[PDB]
Chain A
């Protein structure tokens, strides 16, 4: 372990001592864009440092190349660096060309001090042992995994470090085997950065309703792909909401009251900001459980609505103007008429925040709006950089959406979320009708070669959204065995693909012994190994490890070698 849960306050105090000078701005926060959890964590840090008047700079970085370029550009005065959402799975001192002898001051006296401190803050579990164990400059905000599940790796790393006959060589190979089996592991996510920073705030005592709301947003960002993590962290948020809500309950509503509530939040898509029919129709879970992509699915949906006794005219009405008779009986109606179709998991408990008279909104809807703003908010090596520039710019739109004074931007985000879900649904029914997903014995490939609005999928977030749609659809099919999926999308302007190796997941709400063990995404190591040999102009720079940009002509040989690769 490097920084446990109980000693986050030590890191915060170290940051304050090193860089809380009003003379200059010696603190720089590197945030990974295209990550809602990192966005909420950086918003928390921004508010916390605004309270203590610690001058700081927030830089959205898209890829590892940008991180390296910025660090090279980074001045030596800046003596505190925060990496939010990345950096925990690579040799940062090696990647950034860091040698501790050039950053050490006042070596003496069993202590050491350095002129610059890098605090990595992410949730991807393959901690690089040369970062968590063998470097003092790099300081990792651990969540308790290393101090409990890395004892063997700690011993193996230290023995090899200190040792630089037959028994000695045999034991070295035995220890080196322990390190090797630690690697060759898929990259998962166990915690949410927002929850970690909220734990730090609880240690410092700066918790309030806005920070709790940011924590809820960051945690709810994990419910789509890491539902086990969200279910693990949910009781803590539930306790915090009860702790922070004022005792003056059942009071009259006033234009100033902000209420965090735990009320039934059905697992539909933008239920409060769109019609009930559109909430069922465009839901990922409902689509998986009913197969609405085919023609018979719409008939099933209409039959369900008739069964509940909700007229289609009322069902398609906007949620605000739905008749108060139906809107107040949603719980009873869903209890009576959902287990018939297997949608019992739709009913759920979530967090809903109302700001005075501005109407309710749930964290699930809020994160969809934020994601939409990230995705569509606003010869070959140059236009791609223009895309990176636009993608960085969208981070600030999603950042400004968090402010309560910019609801006119959150509504635009909601509209963009509805449009993007519509486009995702159209492309999904186009893929599943033409049977574009080629089943294999290693990975179910799927390449998007032509169609409409194909420029949406050059963004990694939109491609992951489509992949999550497909994976949710496949997960509820019993015949289809679990298998990694690959999505690609040709970028005509740059003549390059965007391969996004995904991971399968068990059906939502299905809790078993094998469900408890998380599924690990093995595509990162496979991609890196394939790129190391057989130079193919592959661009592996995303913080999301399992996403690469490959030339149009080099895609097929790359996939051939990947098929020959048994790593994944």
Chain B
């Protein structure tokens, strides 16, 4: 198994640039990897305080006590024990999918490929992160590993649901990164002038007015509108 750590060009991700510009790896090499994690520096104050307080505890000797206490509490496993457990699981269990699990995996692979197709059609450019049959086998392998760690001879739908969640959190997240313009500007101007600052309009009405309408999501980023009633109501948040 290959666990490879890389770095996008320019060091930082630079989400202003296209997702294909940050990653210099070819599609062929990127297709082998089952899960392609793209982590980012959130620069969130509440998370930064937590990270700082954790790192300081690491430095000021507090780790040698806290980790030992957690391990003896039973919420952790020492390296010498996890290594033996991993060897035992690998030499004892090789789970195979149940038919209900296989139906879920197929119906999810179709959804994933449809989403990739619509993203490619919208962007009119092949996605840098590929989704192929090798990724269906990747989800199969993740499901079987999740079942294996429990020594379950057959992989239920719980493992399929968790494997699907893991794939969505890693490779779909990597592939979903996004950077016409005249239509976006027209939509923003017309809804700013028509829909007042303090009121709300329903989305079916905006559809009648008319697309994918990513302009509404962009405005939601700018905190000028807000979809509240389960997406059925578009409310001008006050900007």
Is the CB of A255 closer than 8 A to any CB of chain B? no
Q: Count residues on chain A whose CB falls below 8 Å from chain B CBs.
A: 4
**Of A451, A452, A455, which is in contact with the most chain B CB atoms at under 10 Å from its CB?**
A452
Is the CB of B65 closer than 8 A to any CB of chain A? yes
Question: Mask for B62-74, Cβ within 8 A of A = 1, else 0?
Answer: 1011000100000
Q: Name B36-75 residues within 8 Å CB distance of A.
A: 60-62, 64-65, 69
> Chain B contact residues: over half helix, strand or loop, or mixed?
helix
Q: Name A452-477 residues within 8 Å CB distance of B.
A: 452-453, 455
What are the residues of chain B within 8 A of A455 when measuring CB–CB?
Answer: 65, 69
Measured between alpha carbons, how far is A453 from B66 in the docked complex, in Å?
A: 9
CB-nearest residue of chain B to A456:
B65
What are the residues of chain B within 8 A of A453 when measuring CB–CB?
Answer: 61, 64-65
Question: Mask for A261-291, Cβ within 8 A of B = 1, else 0?
Answer: 0000000000000000000000000000000
Measured between alpha carbons, how far is A339 from B61 in the docked complex, in Å?
A: 40
Measured between alpha carbons, how far is A452 from B66 in the docked complex, in Å?
A: 11
In whole Å, how far is B172's beta carbon from the nearest beta carbon of chain A? 42
CB-nearest residue of chain B to A453:
B65
Please tell me the size bucket of the interface on B: under 10
Measured between alpha carbons, how far is A453 from B62 in the docked complex, in Å?
A: 7
In whole Å, how far is B14's beta carbon from the nearest beta carbon of chain A? 42
In whole Å, how far is B57's beta carbon from the nearest beta carbon of chain A? 11
Question: Mask for A427-451, Cβ within 8 A of B = 1, else 0?
Answer: 0000000000000000000000001
What are the residues of chain A within 8 A of B69 when measuring CB–CB?
Answer: 455
Q: Name A373-395 residues within 8 Å CB distance of B.
A: none
CB-nearest residue of chain B to A455:
B65
What are the residues of chain B within 8 A of A452 when measuring CB–CB?
Answer: 60-62, 64-65
In whole Å, how far is B140's beta carbon from the nearest beta carbon of chain A? 44
In whole Å, how far is A462's beta carbon from the nearest beta carbon of chain B? 14
What are the residues of chain A within 8 A of B61 when measuring CB–CB?
Answer: 451-453
CB-nearest residue of chain A to B62:
A452
Measured between alpha carbons, how far is A50 from B52 in the docked complex, in Å?
A: 59
Q: Name A215-249 residues within 8 Å CB distance of B.
A: none
Measured between alpha carbons, how far is A453 from B65 in the docked complex, in Å?
A: 6
What are the residues of chain A within 8 A of B65 when measuring CB–CB?
Answer: 452-453, 455
CB-nearest residue of chain A to B61:
A452
Q: Name B57-98 residues within 8 Å CB distance of A.
A: 60-62, 64-65, 69
In whole Å, how far is B73's beta carbon from the nearest beta carbon of chain A? 11
In whole Å, how far is A57's beta carbon from the nearest beta carbon of chain B? 30
Measured between alpha carbons, how far is A451 from B61 in the docked complex, in Å?
A: 8
What are the residues of chain A within 8 A of B64 when measuring CB–CB?
Answer: 452-453
Measured between alpha carbons, how far is A391 from B60 in the docked complex, in Å?
A: 28
Measured between alpha carbons, how far is A127 from B65 in the docked complex, in Å?
A: 42
Measured between alpha carbons, how far is A453 from B69 in the docked complex, in Å?
A: 11
What are the residues of chain A within 8 A of B60 when measuring CB–CB?
Answer: 452
Measured between alpha carbons, how far is A452 from B58 in the docked complex, in Å?
A: 11
In whole Å, how far is A451's beta carbon from the nearest beta carbon of chain B? 8
CB-nearest residue of chain A to B68:
A453
Measured between alpha carbons, how far is A455 from B65 in the docked complex, in Å?
A: 9
In whole Å, how far is B28's beta carbon from the nearest beta carbon of chain A? 51
CB-nearest residue of chain B to A450:
B60
Measured between alpha carbons, how far is A455 from B60 in the docked complex, in Å?
A: 15
Measured between alpha carbons, how far is A451 from B62 in the docked complex, in Å?
A: 9
CB-nearest residue of chain A to B69:
A455
In whole Å, how far is B68's beta carbon from the nearest beta carbon of chain A? 10
Q: Name B174-216 residues within 8 Å CB distance of A.
A: none
Measured between alpha carbons, how far is A455 from B62 in the docked complex, in Å?
A: 11
CB-nearest residue of chain A to B66:
A455
What are the residues of chain A within 8 A of B62 when measuring CB–CB?
Answer: 452
Which 7 residue pairs of A and B lie closest in terms of their CB atoms, listed nearest first? A452-B61, A453-B65, A455-B65, A452-B65, A452-B64, A452-B62, A453-B61
Other A-B pairs beyond A452-B62, A455-B69, 9, CB < 8 Å: A451-B61, A452-B60, A452-B61, A452-B64, A452-B65, A453-B61, A453-B64, A453-B65, A455-B65
A/B interface sample: 11 pairs, CB < 8 A? A451-B61, A452-B60, A452-B61, A452-B62, A452-B64, A452-B65, A453-B61, A453-B64, A453-B65, A455-B65, A455-B69
Q: Which B residues are closer than 8 A to A by beta carbons?
A: 60-62, 64-65, 69
Q: Which A residues are closer than 8 A to B by beta carbons?
A: 451-453, 455
